[PDB]
């Protein structure tokens, strides 16, 4: 349904497989029953984390996620965004999996894979609001899994119905900006290692209320409200990255969203917008079923 590695998806070698809980996952589950301003990711905390890397010049392009031993999920706008003259071909990119350090070439840890083909949702709307901001990248050859490389699960209807609720927290990860960056400054820019932040899903009415940009059912927003005190948000560079939730039903990590867009980063009254993975999952299914798992 997604490719080799789906059966054991969402279970991390360094955590679930060892009956070890990461430092902030209980915060997520508590929200179900009860990157700016984030923190350094733990080793193997997000084994599905993928870094979209430009072949030449060598630079970080976006975040992404591993959904199988041969398929990588990301935001459509990460590969195609005409307004900024962006339109990559499978030949210009590489995917770096199992990474922690943003800049270091982590030999014997990370895996750099070439792309066989990229697919962008046919109805992706880059013109207005990045509607249907989803894309898939098939690796030239399957990658072997490791303590640092493991696919995330794609949500089924029941899991999505249960967890996609206002207040329910998800986890966003990426090597994106540590803060809104507009001009040269000696302050914090990009992180040294993968950043992680847990954020609550926001009620659709508030999401639409927070922006002049037209919101569609193919997206959802997350982040704390000003009155909630806590902060946190994805930022430029986190695009394409995963917004995951740990299922209380089978303790597997599911990707409910993809870092899509926002206005500024961690601004009061603003919320990060993510691609609604479940609602667009059937496209992923159609593509993978057509072009082999």
């Amino acid at each position: 349904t997604f490719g080799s590695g789906e059966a054991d998806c969402g279970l991390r070698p360094l955590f679930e497989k060892k009956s070890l809980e990461d430092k902030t996952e209980r915060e997520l589950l508590e929200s179900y029953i009860d990157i700016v301003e984030g923190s350094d990711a733990e080793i193997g905390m997000s084994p599905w984390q993928v870094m979209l890397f430009r072949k030449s010049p060598q630079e970080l392009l976006c975040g992404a996620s591993l959904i199988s031993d041969r398929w990588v999920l990301t935001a459509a706008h990460c590969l195609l965004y005409p307004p900024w003259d962006k339109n990559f071909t499978e030949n210009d990119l590489l995917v770096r999996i199992g990474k922690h350090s943003r800049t270091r070439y982590e030999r014997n840890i990370e895996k750099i894979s070439m792309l066989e083909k990229i697919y962008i949702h046919p109805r992706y709307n880059w013109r207005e609001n990045l509607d249907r901001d989803i894309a898939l990248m098939k690796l030239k050859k399957p990658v072997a899994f490791s303590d640092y490389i493991h696919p995330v699960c794609l949500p089924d209807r029941e899991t999505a119905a249960s967890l996609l609720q206002a207040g329910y927290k998800g986890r966003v990860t990426g090597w994106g900006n540590l803060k809104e960056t507009w001009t040269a400054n000696v302050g914090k820019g990009q992180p040294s290692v993968l950043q992680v932040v847990n954020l609550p899903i926001v009620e659709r009415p508030v999401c639409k209320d927070s922006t002049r940009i037209r919101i569609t059912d193919n997206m959802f927003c997350a982040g704390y409200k000003p009155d909630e005190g806590k902060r946190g948000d994805a930022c430029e560079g986190d695009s394409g990255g995963p917004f995951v939730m740990k299922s209380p039903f089978n303790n597997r990590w599911y990707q409910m969203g993809i870092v899509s867009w926002g206005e500024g980063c961690d601004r009061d009254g603003k919320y990060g917008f993510y691609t609604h993975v479940f609602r667009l999952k059937k496209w992923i299914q159609k593509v993978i079923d057509q072009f082999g798992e």
């Binding site: 030449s56 060598q58 630079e59 970080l60 590489l94 770096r96 800049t103 070439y105 750099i112 070439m114």
Partner: peptide, 11 residues
């Protein structure tokens, strides 16, 4: 600022 990756990945 990015450590260069093995050239075998650029081919």
């Amino acid at each position: 600022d990015f450590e260069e990756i093995p050239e075998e990945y650029l081919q």
